[PDB]
């Protein structure tokens, strides 16, 4: 209570003293400034040249209090800008914090986990540096227990959060050898009862799946897709969000990888996802659907069997534009690879009207994506001879009148398909 509101100069004065206690008091004061909720004087702490002195206190084993005070202190300094996080790493904090992971005091080792989390969370460079210092083995060792429930709640949460940061960022992506080293424990954290652990766990996965098919594969081969589909139907939005992102990334890969999420029973959840109150959930859901309709024909059939086509029509009809744009993509991929019988069913569900009303939108790309679909539908109509019957349906919903305007559009690729449609069919 007597270390509240110290001046930065006072903190340096006590730390520069030859008295261990005086240093401890000043260090605790420095922390209380950083933990003051309104704009802490980080830059001033750095320009004072204290960081190096804080890092050296992390080594004082005999005095565990100052270890905690300094770990806490540096943690907040590392939570700032990349320039401020760089200062902590420059002070030689990485190897010091990794040493604290073996500390007998859980509350101290938790700070090391917290700190290293901020450092790796900065970017790929520091992420890889934390890994090169050998921070993974210690971290994973802290979770080497029969049951995770016995571990402290907050302690388990921060550990998970730190691990998710070591799987974060893309350019470059985390070392393959490091990802394999963490996955097994990540799959274990993906079955824990705590929601915050499941959330961060799903985010960790969503990071790994984000990339080439080789990255997606090593995650799929761990057999987590089923667990993700289970989490995909959770009540907590914070949990469903990353789960949907993960599944959304897995379906961007091979059709075999895409088939795994179908076998898991993911499509049975989309009736809720495609009508989910939150707008972004619909956008992510529809985006995932577009990567499924772009697969095989038997895969497109799965979507038809689950009666998800009507939902795509509803989302194409009334939703946030961003979501409606994803809907257009879903239809386009659906009409390009789907059979005639499939495209027919799509039309009888009432896809035309809502697909024509989106031609009024002022987005250059969606128009291309739509017109492309229209061409694909006619492409099937010719195989039935009912190109005339289709033209009429488009004409009765003020569709032709809008294609007439796109026939004279600025973008070159637009008027190409438009004029080609007016001429060939109308």
């Amino acid at each position: 209570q007597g270390t509240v509101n110290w001046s930065v100069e006072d903190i340096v004065k006590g730390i520069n003293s030859n008295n261990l206690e005086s240093q401890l008091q000043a260090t605790q004061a420095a922390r209380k400034l950083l933990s003051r909720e309104k704009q802490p004087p980080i830059d001033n702490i750095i320009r004072a040249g204290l960081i190096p002195k804080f890092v050296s206190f992390l080594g004082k084993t005999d005095c565990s209090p100052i270890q905690f005070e300094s770990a806490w202190a540096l943690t907040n300094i590392a939570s700032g800008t990349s320039e401020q996080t760089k200062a902590v790493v420059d002070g030689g904090a990485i190897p010091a914090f990794i040493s604290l992971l073996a500390s007998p005091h859980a509350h101290i080792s938790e700070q090391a986990v917290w700190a290293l989390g901020n450092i790796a969370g900065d970017g790929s460079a520091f992420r890889d540096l934390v890994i090169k210092h050998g921070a993974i083995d210690p971290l994973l060792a802290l979770l080497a227990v029969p049951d995770l429930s016995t571990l402290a709640c907050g302690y388990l949460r921060n550990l998970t959060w730190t691990l998710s940061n070591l799987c974060r960022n893309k350019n470059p992506a985390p070392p393959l050898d490091a990802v394999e080293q963490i996955l097994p424990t990540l799959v274990r954290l993906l079955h824990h009862n705590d929601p915050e652990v499941l959330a961060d766990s799903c985010w960790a996965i969503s990071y790994l799946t984000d990339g080439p098919n080789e990255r997606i594969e090593m995650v799929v081969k761990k057999g987590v897709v089923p667990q993700l589909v289970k989490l995909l139907g959770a009540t907590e939005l914070p949990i469903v969000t990353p789960a949907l992102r993960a599944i959304g990334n897995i379906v961007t890969g091979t059709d075999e990888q895409t088939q795994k999420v179908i076998d898991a029973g993911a499509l049975a959840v989309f009736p809720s996802l495609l009508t989910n109150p939150k707008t972004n959930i619909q956008k992510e859901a529809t985006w995932t659907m577009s990567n499924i309709t772009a697969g095989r024909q038997d895969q497109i059939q799965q979507v038809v069997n689950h009666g998800l086509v009507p939902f795509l029509v509803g989302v194409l009809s009334k939703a946030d534009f961003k979501t409606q744009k994803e809907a257009a993509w879903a239809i386009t991929n659906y009409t390009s690879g789907g059979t005639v019988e499939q495209i027919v069913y799509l039309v009888h569900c009432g896809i035309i009207e809502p697909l024509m009303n989106l031609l009024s939108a002022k987005d250059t790309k969606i128009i291309q994506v739509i017109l492309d679909a229209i061409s694909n539908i006619f492409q099937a109509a010719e195989k039935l001879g009912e190109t005339e019957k289709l033209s009429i349906m488009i004409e009765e919903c003020g569709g032709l009148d809008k294609i007439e305007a796109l026939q004279r559009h600025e973008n070159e690729s637009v008027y190409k398909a438009s004029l080609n449609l007016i001429e060939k069919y109308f």
Binding site: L34, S35, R36, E37, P40, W72, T75, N76, A78, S79, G80, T85, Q111, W114, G117, N118, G121, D122, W161, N165, R168, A199, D200, W203, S206, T241, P242, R245
Partner: peptide, 12 residues
């Protein structure tokens, strides 16, 4: 793209 990649421990 999810949660903040940096946490400051500033309790009350």
């Amino acid at each position: 793209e999810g949660p903040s990649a940096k946490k400051p421990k500033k309790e009350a």
